[PDB]
C-alpha cells in the first residue's frame, strides 16, 4: 500500500553510486593531472 | 521488524562504489603510466 522498501534501496544505491563515482573519480583525475603545473611538450 | 536496513545500505553502497572506483580509477592511471613510460630510449 505505502510502497515497498525496494524504492528507498534503489534511490539510495542509485544516487550514491553516480555522485560518489563521478565526484571521487574526477577528483583523482584532477589531482595527478594538475600536479604537472605545466604543459607544452 | 528488525531487518538491518542501514547495515545493508552502507555495505551495498560501500562495496559497489569501492569496486567500480578502485578498478576503474587504477585502469585509466595505469593506461597512460605504461604508454607514457618508455624509459628505453
mmCIF file with all atom_site columns, N, CA, C and O in Angstrom, chain A residues 4-41:
data_model
loop_
_atom_site.group_PDB
_atom_site.id
_atom_site.type_symbol
_atom_site.label_atom_id
_atom_site.label_alt_id
_atom_site.label_comp_id
_atom_site.label_asym_id
_atom_site.label_entity_id
_atom_site.label_seq_id
_atom_site.pdbx_PDB_ins_code
_atom_site.Cartn_x
_atom_site.Cartn_y
_atom_site.Cartn_z
_atom_site.occupancy
_atom_site.B_iso_or_equiv
_atom_site.pdbx_formal_charge
_atom_site.auth_seq_id
_atom_site.auth_comp_id
_atom_site.auth_asym_id
_atom_site.auth_atom_id
_atom_site.pdbx_PDB_model_num
ATOM 1   N N  . UNK A 1 4  ? 6.842  -0.321 -1.305  1.00 0.00 ? 4  UNK A N  1
ATOM 2   C CA . UNK A 1 4  ? 7.728  -1.286 -0.583  1.00 0.00 ? 4  UNK A CA 1
ATOM 3   C C  . UNK A 1 4  ? 9.127  -0.669 -0.422  1.00 0.00 ? 4  UNK A C  1
ATOM 4   O O  . UNK A 1 4  ? 9.476  0.249  -1.168  1.00 0.00 ? 4  UNK A O  1
ATOM 5   N N  . UNK A 1 5  ? 9.942  -1.142 0.526   1.00 0.00 ? 5  UNK A N  1
ATOM 6   C CA . UNK A 1 5  ? 11.322 -0.591 0.743   1.00 0.00 ? 5  UNK A CA 1
ATOM 7   C C  . UNK A 1 5  ? 12.189 -0.666 -0.519  1.00 0.00 ? 5  UNK A C  1
ATOM 8   O O  . UNK A 1 5  ? 13.205 0.028  -0.623  1.00 0.00 ? 5  UNK A O  1
ATOM 9   N N  . UNK A 1 6  ? 11.807 -1.487 -1.476  1.00 0.00 ? 6  UNK A N  1
ATOM 10  C CA . UNK A 1 6  ? 12.595 -1.620 -2.749  1.00 0.00 ? 6  UNK A CA 1
ATOM 11  C C  . UNK A 1 6  ? 12.880 -0.234 -3.340  1.00 0.00 ? 6  UNK A C  1
ATOM 12  O O  . UNK A 1 6  ? 13.889 -0.043 -4.027  1.00 0.00 ? 6  UNK A O  1
ATOM 13  N N  . UNK A 1 7  ? 12.012 0.723  -3.094  1.00 0.00 ? 7  UNK A N  1
ATOM 14  C CA . UNK A 1 7  ? 12.206 2.103  -3.640  1.00 0.00 ? 7  UNK A CA 1
ATOM 15  C C  . UNK A 1 7  ? 13.370 2.786  -2.922  1.00 0.00 ? 7  UNK A C  1
ATOM 16  O O  . UNK A 1 7  ? 14.344 3.201  -3.559  1.00 0.00 ? 7  UNK A O  1
ATOM 17  N N  . UNK A 1 8  ? 13.281 2.925  -1.617  1.00 0.00 ? 8  UNK A N  1
ATOM 18  C CA . UNK A 1 8  ? 14.366 3.604  -0.836  1.00 0.00 ? 8  UNK A CA 1
ATOM 19  C C  . UNK A 1 8  ? 15.717 2.916  -1.079  1.00 0.00 ? 8  UNK A C  1
ATOM 20  O O  . UNK A 1 8  ? 16.770 3.549  -0.935  1.00 0.00 ? 8  UNK A O  1
ATOM 21  N N  . UNK A 1 9  ? 15.715 1.652  -1.438  1.00 0.00 ? 9  UNK A N  1
ATOM 22  C CA . UNK A 1 9  ? 17.002 0.926  -1.685  1.00 0.00 ? 9  UNK A CA 1
ATOM 23  C C  . UNK A 1 9  ? 17.591 1.350  -3.031  1.00 0.00 ? 9  UNK A C  1
ATOM 24  O O  . UNK A 1 9  ? 18.783 1.662  -3.121  1.00 0.00 ? 9  UNK A O  1
ATOM 25  N N  . UNK A 1 10 ? 16.788 1.358  -4.071  1.00 0.00 ? 10 UNK A N  1
ATOM 26  C CA . UNK A 1 10 ? 17.288 1.748  -5.430  1.00 0.00 ? 10 UNK A CA 1
ATOM 27  C C  . UNK A 1 10 ? 17.646 3.236  -5.431  1.00 0.00 ? 10 UNK A C  1
ATOM 28  O O  . UNK A 1 10 ? 18.666 3.636  -6.004  1.00 0.00 ? 10 UNK A O  1
ATOM 29  N N  . UNK A 1 11 ? 16.820 4.055  -4.822  1.00 0.00 ? 11 UNK A N  1
ATOM 30  C CA . UNK A 1 11 ? 17.076 5.531  -4.793  1.00 0.00 ? 11 UNK A CA 1
ATOM 31  C C  . UNK A 1 11 ? 18.417 5.813  -4.100  1.00 0.00 ? 11 UNK A C  1
ATOM 32  O O  . UNK A 1 11 ? 19.196 6.639  -4.583  1.00 0.00 ? 11 UNK A O  1
ATOM 33  N N  . UNK A 1 12 ? 18.689 5.168  -2.983  1.00 0.00 ? 12 UNK A N  1
ATOM 34  C CA . UNK A 1 12 ? 19.974 5.421  -2.246  1.00 0.00 ? 12 UNK A CA 1
ATOM 35  C C  . UNK A 1 12 ? 21.163 4.849  -3.034  1.00 0.00 ? 12 UNK A C  1
ATOM 36  O O  . UNK A 1 12 ? 22.118 5.578  -3.325  1.00 0.00 ? 12 UNK A O  1
ATOM 37  N N  . UNK A 1 13 ? 21.135 3.578  -3.366  1.00 0.00 ? 13 UNK A N  1
ATOM 38  C CA . UNK A 1 13 ? 22.273 2.956  -4.118  1.00 0.00 ? 13 UNK A CA 1
ATOM 39  C C  . UNK A 1 13 ? 22.458 3.634  -5.479  1.00 0.00 ? 13 UNK A C  1
ATOM 40  O O  . UNK A 1 13 ? 23.571 3.670  -6.014  1.00 0.00 ? 13 UNK A O  1
ATOM 41  N N  . UNK A 1 14 ? 21.392 4.147  -6.055  1.00 0.00 ? 14 UNK A N  1
ATOM 42  C CA . UNK A 1 14 ? 21.479 4.803  -7.398  1.00 0.00 ? 14 UNK A CA 1
ATOM 43  C C  . UNK A 1 14 ? 22.226 6.135  -7.319  1.00 0.00 ? 14 UNK A C  1
ATOM 44  O O  . UNK A 1 14 ? 23.267 6.305  -7.965  1.00 0.00 ? 14 UNK A O  1
ATOM 45  N N  . UNK A 1 15 ? 21.703 7.087  -6.575  1.00 0.00 ? 15 UNK A N  1
ATOM 46  C CA . UNK A 1 15 ? 22.359 8.434  -6.479  1.00 0.00 ? 15 UNK A CA 1
ATOM 47  C C  . UNK A 1 15 ? 23.757 8.313  -5.875  1.00 0.00 ? 15 UNK A C  1
ATOM 48  O O  . UNK A 1 15 ? 24.701 8.941  -6.359  1.00 0.00 ? 15 UNK A O  1
ATOM 49  N N  . UNK A 1 16 ? 23.896 7.547  -4.821  1.00 0.00 ? 16 UNK A N  1
ATOM 50  C CA . UNK A 1 16 ? 25.227 7.393  -4.153  1.00 0.00 ? 16 UNK A CA 1
ATOM 51  C C  . UNK A 1 16 ? 26.257 6.866  -5.150  1.00 0.00 ? 16 UNK A C  1
ATOM 52  O O  . UNK A 1 16 ? 27.416 7.291  -5.126  1.00 0.00 ? 16 UNK A O  1
ATOM 53  N N  . UNK A 1 17 ? 25.869 5.944  -6.005  1.00 0.00 ? 17 UNK A N  1
ATOM 54  C CA . UNK A 1 17 ? 26.833 5.363  -6.997  1.00 0.00 ? 17 UNK A CA 1
ATOM 55  C C  . UNK A 1 17 ? 27.273 6.416  -8.014  1.00 0.00 ? 17 UNK A C  1
ATOM 56  O O  . UNK A 1 17 ? 28.462 6.511  -8.333  1.00 0.00 ? 17 UNK A O  1
ATOM 57  N N  . UNK A 1 18 ? 26.347 7.186  -8.548  1.00 0.00 ? 18 UNK A N  1
ATOM 58  C CA . UNK A 1 18 ? 26.710 8.218  -9.573  1.00 0.00 ? 18 UNK A CA 1
ATOM 59  C C  . UNK A 1 18 ? 27.429 9.395  -8.920  1.00 0.00 ? 18 UNK A C  1
ATOM 60  O O  . UNK A 1 18 ? 28.429 9.886  -9.452  1.00 0.00 ? 18 UNK A O  1
ATOM 61  N N  . UNK A 1 19 ? 26.935 9.865  -7.801  1.00 0.00 ? 19 UNK A N  1
ATOM 62  C CA . UNK A 1 19 ? 27.566 11.034 -7.111  1.00 0.00 ? 19 UNK A CA 1
ATOM 63  C C  . UNK A 1 19 ? 28.949 10.663 -6.577  1.00 0.00 ? 19 UNK A C  1
ATOM 64  O O  . UNK A 1 19 ? 29.901 11.432 -6.739  1.00 0.00 ? 19 UNK A O  1
ATOM 65  N N  . UNK A 1 20 ? 29.076 9.529  -5.924  1.00 0.00 ? 20 UNK A N  1
ATOM 66  C CA . UNK A 1 20 ? 30.397 9.127  -5.346  1.00 0.00 ? 20 UNK A CA 1
ATOM 67  C C  . UNK A 1 20 ? 31.379 8.747  -6.450  1.00 0.00 ? 20 UNK A C  1
ATOM 68  O O  . UNK A 1 20 ? 32.575 9.033  -6.342  1.00 0.00 ? 20 UNK A O  1
ATOM 69  N N  . UNK A 1 21 ? 30.915 8.087  -7.487  1.00 0.00 ? 21 UNK A N  1
ATOM 70  C CA . UNK A 1 21 ? 31.835 7.653  -8.588  1.00 0.00 ? 21 UNK A CA 1
ATOM 71  C C  . UNK A 1 21 ? 32.305 8.849  -9.420  1.00 0.00 ? 21 UNK A C  1
ATOM 72  O O  . UNK A 1 21 ? 33.503 8.988  -9.674  1.00 0.00 ? 21 UNK A O  1
ATOM 73  N N  . UNK A 1 22 ? 31.403 9.694  -9.866  1.00 0.00 ? 22 UNK A N  1
ATOM 74  C CA . UNK A 1 22 ? 31.808 10.865 -10.714 1.00 0.00 ? 22 UNK A CA 1
ATOM 75  C C  . UNK A 1 22 ? 32.581 11.901 -9.896  1.00 0.00 ? 22 UNK A C  1
ATOM 76  O O  . UNK A 1 22 ? 33.556 12.479 -10.393 1.00 0.00 ? 22 UNK A O  1
ATOM 77  N N  . UNK A 1 23 ? 32.160 12.170 -8.683  1.00 0.00 ? 23 UNK A N  1
ATOM 78  C CA . UNK A 1 23 ? 32.857 13.203 -7.846  1.00 0.00 ? 23 UNK A CA 1
ATOM 79  C C  . UNK A 1 23 ? 34.203 12.669 -7.346  1.00 0.00 ? 23 UNK A C  1
ATOM 80  O O  . UNK A 1 23 ? 35.210 13.385 -7.396  1.00 0.00 ? 23 UNK A O  1
ATOM 81  N N  . UNK A 1 24 ? 34.236 11.456 -6.843  1.00 0.00 ? 24 UNK A N  1
ATOM 82  C CA . UNK A 1 24 ? 35.512 10.887 -6.303  1.00 0.00 ? 24 UNK A CA 1
ATOM 83  C C  . UNK A 1 24 ? 36.489 10.578 -7.435  1.00 0.00 ? 24 UNK A C  1
ATOM 84  O O  . UNK A 1 24 ? 37.666 10.947 -7.349  1.00 0.00 ? 24 UNK A O  1
ATOM 85  N N  . UNK A 1 25 ? 36.042 9.910  -8.477  1.00 0.00 ? 25 UNK A N  1
ATOM 86  C CA . UNK A 1 25 ? 36.963 9.568  -9.609  1.00 0.00 ? 25 UNK A CA 1
ATOM 87  C C  . UNK A 1 25 ? 37.471 10.856 -10.251 1.00 0.00 ? 25 UNK A C  1
ATOM 88  O O  . UNK A 1 25 ? 38.681 11.025 -10.413 1.00 0.00 ? 25 UNK A O  1
ATOM 89  N N  . UNK A 1 26 ? 36.585 11.760 -10.616 1.00 0.00 ? 26 UNK A N  1
ATOM 90  C CA . UNK A 1 26 ? 37.019 13.043 -11.259 1.00 0.00 ? 26 UNK A CA 1
ATOM 91  C C  . UNK A 1 26 ? 38.031 13.756 -10.364 1.00 0.00 ? 26 UNK A C  1
ATOM 92  O O  . UNK A 1 26 ? 38.958 14.407 -10.861 1.00 0.00 ? 26 UNK A O  1
ATOM 93  N N  . UNK A 1 27 ? 37.872 13.646 -9.064  1.00 0.00 ? 27 UNK A N  1
ATOM 94  C CA . UNK A 1 27 ? 38.818 14.312 -8.115  1.00 0.00 ? 27 UNK A CA 1
ATOM 95  C C  . UNK A 1 27 ? 40.223 13.742 -8.326  1.00 0.00 ? 27 UNK A C  1
ATOM 96  O O  . UNK A 1 27 ? 41.205 14.490 -8.340  1.00 0.00 ? 27 UNK A O  1
ATOM 97  N N  . UNK A 1 28 ? 40.334 12.440 -8.480  1.00 0.00 ? 28 UNK A N  1
ATOM 98  C CA . UNK A 1 28 ? 41.683 11.799 -8.676  1.00 0.00 ? 28 UNK A CA 1
ATOM 99  C C  . UNK A 1 28 ? 42.284 12.284 -9.996  1.00 0.00 ? 28 UNK A C  1
ATOM 100 O O  . UNK A 1 28 ? 43.472 12.615 -10.060 1.00 0.00 ? 28 UNK A O  1
ATOM 101 N N  . UNK A 1 29 ? 41.491 12.305 -11.045 1.00 0.00 ? 29 UNK A N  1
ATOM 102 C CA . UNK A 1 29 ? 41.997 12.739 -12.389 1.00 0.00 ? 29 UNK A CA 1
ATOM 103 C C  . UNK A 1 29 ? 42.614 14.136 -12.284 1.00 0.00 ? 29 UNK A C  1
ATOM 104 O O  . UNK A 1 29 ? 43.675 14.398 -12.859 1.00 0.00 ? 29 UNK A O  1
ATOM 105 N N  . UNK A 1 30 ? 41.960 15.035 -11.587 1.00 0.00 ? 30 UNK A N  1
ATOM 106 C CA . UNK A 1 30 ? 42.478 16.437 -11.456 1.00 0.00 ? 30 UNK A CA 1
ATOM 107 C C  . UNK A 1 30 ? 43.686 16.485 -10.516 1.00 0.00 ? 30 UNK A C  1
ATOM 108 O O  . UNK A 1 30 ? 44.548 17.357 -10.666 1.00 0.00 ? 30 UNK A O  1
ATOM 109 N N  . UNK A 1 31 ? 43.752 15.606 -9.540  1.00 0.00 ? 31 UNK A N  1
ATOM 110 C CA . UNK A 1 31 ? 44.888 15.630 -8.562  1.00 0.00 ? 31 UNK A CA 1
ATOM 111 C C  . UNK A 1 31 ? 46.214 15.278 -9.244  1.00 0.00 ? 31 UNK A C  1
ATOM 112 O O  . UNK A 1 31 ? 47.212 15.979 -9.040  1.00 0.00 ? 31 UNK A O  1
ATOM 113 N N  . UNK A 1 32 ? 46.265 14.211 -10.017 1.00 0.00 ? 32 UNK A N  1
ATOM 114 C CA . UNK A 1 32 ? 47.558 13.820 -10.676 1.00 0.00 ? 32 UNK A CA 1
ATOM 115 C C  . UNK A 1 32 ? 47.796 14.645 -11.940 1.00 0.00 ? 32 UNK A C  1
ATOM 116 O O  . UNK A 1 32 ? 48.948 14.957 -12.261 1.00 0.00 ? 32 UNK A O  1
ATOM 117 N N  . UNK A 1 33 ? 46.753 14.996 -12.662 1.00 0.00 ? 33 UNK A N  1
ATOM 118 C CA . UNK A 1 33 ? 46.939 15.799 -13.915 1.00 0.00 ? 33 UNK A CA 1
ATOM 119 C C  . UNK A 1 33 ? 47.335 17.229 -13.556 1.00 0.00 ? 33 UNK A C  1
ATOM 120 O O  . UNK A 1 33 ? 48.185 17.825 -14.226 1.00 0.00 ? 33 UNK A O  1
ATOM 121 N N  . UNK A 1 34 ? 46.742 17.787 -12.522 1.00 0.00 ? 34 UNK A N  1
ATOM 122 C CA . UNK A 1 34 ? 47.078 19.188 -12.108 1.00 0.00 ? 34 UNK A CA 1
ATOM 123 C C  . UNK A 1 34 ? 48.475 19.230 -11.489 1.00 0.00 ? 34 UNK A C  1
ATOM 124 O O  . UNK A 1 34 ? 49.167 20.247 -11.583 1.00 0.00 ? 34 UNK A O  1
ATOM 125 N N  . UNK A 1 35 ? 48.899 18.154 -10.860 1.00 0.00 ? 35 UNK A N  1
ATOM 126 C CA . UNK A 1 35 ? 50.255 18.112 -10.219 1.00 0.00 ? 35 UNK A CA 1
ATOM 127 C C  . UNK A 1 35 ? 51.327 18.544 -11.223 1.00 0.00 ? 35 UNK A C  1
ATOM 128 O O  . UNK A 1 35 ? 52.365 19.086 -10.829 1.00 0.00 ? 35 UNK A O  1
ATOM 129 N N  . UNK A 1 36 ? 51.098 18.323 -12.502 1.00 0.00 ? 36 UNK A N  1
ATOM 130 C CA . UNK A 1 36 ? 52.098 18.722 -13.546 1.00 0.00 ? 36 UNK A CA 1
ATOM 131 C C  . UNK A 1 36 ? 52.425 20.205 -13.387 1.00 0.00 ? 36 UNK A C  1
ATOM 132 O O  . UNK A 1 36 ? 53.596 20.593 -13.364 1.00 0.00 ? 36 UNK A O  1
ATOM 133 N N  . UNK A 1 37 ? 51.408 21.040 -13.269 1.00 0.00 ? 37 UNK A N  1
ATOM 134 C CA . UNK A 1 37 ? 51.609 22.524 -13.100 1.00 0.00 ? 37 UNK A CA 1
ATOM 135 C C  . UNK A 1 37 ? 52.116 23.169 -14.406 1.00 0.00 ? 37 UNK A C  1
ATOM 136 O O  . UNK A 1 37 ? 52.226 24.398 -14.478 1.00 0.00 ? 37 UNK A O  1
ATOM 137 N N  . UNK A 1 38 ? 52.417 22.388 -15.429 1.00 0.00 ? 38 UNK A N  1
ATOM 138 C CA . UNK A 1 38 ? 52.911 22.972 -16.715 1.00 0.00 ? 38 UNK A CA 1
ATOM 139 C C  . UNK A 1 38 ? 52.489 22.075 -17.878 1.00 0.00 ? 38 UNK A C  1
ATOM 140 O O  . UNK A 1 38 ? 52.184 20.895 -17.680 1.00 0.00 ? 38 UNK A O  1
ATOM 141 N N  . UNK A 1 39 ? 52.470 22.613 -19.078 1.00 0.00 ? 39 UNK A N  1
ATOM 142 C CA . UNK A 1 39 ? 52.072 21.813 -20.277 1.00 0.00 ? 39 UNK A CA 1
ATOM 143 C C  . UNK A 1 39 ? 53.048 22.127 -21.427 1.00 0.00 ? 39 UNK A C  1
ATOM 144 O O  . UNK A 1 39 ? 54.171 22.573 -21.176 1.00 0.00 ? 39 UNK A O  1
ATOM 145 N N  . UNK A 1 40 ? 52.650 21.908 -22.671 1.00 0.00 ? 40 UNK A N  1
ATOM 146 C CA . UNK A 1 40 ? 53.545 22.192 -23.844 1.00 0.00 ? 40 UNK A CA 1
ATOM 147 C C  . UNK A 1 40 ? 54.719 21.202 -23.826 1.00 0.00 ? 40 UNK A C  1
ATOM 148 O O  . UNK A 1 40 ? 55.548 21.241 -22.913 1.00 0.00 ? 40 UNK A O  1
ATOM 149 N N  . UNK A 1 41 ? 54.809 20.325 -24.812 1.00 0.00 ? 41 UNK A N  1
ATOM 150 C CA . UNK A 1 41 ? 55.933 19.334 -24.860 1.00 0.00 ? 41 UNK A CA 1
ATOM 151 C C  . UNK A 1 41 ? 56.603 19.393 -26.233 1.00 0.00 ? 41 UNK A C  1
ATOM 152 O O  . UNK A 1 41 ? 57.373 18.496 -26.535 1.00 0.00 ? 41 UNK A O  1
#
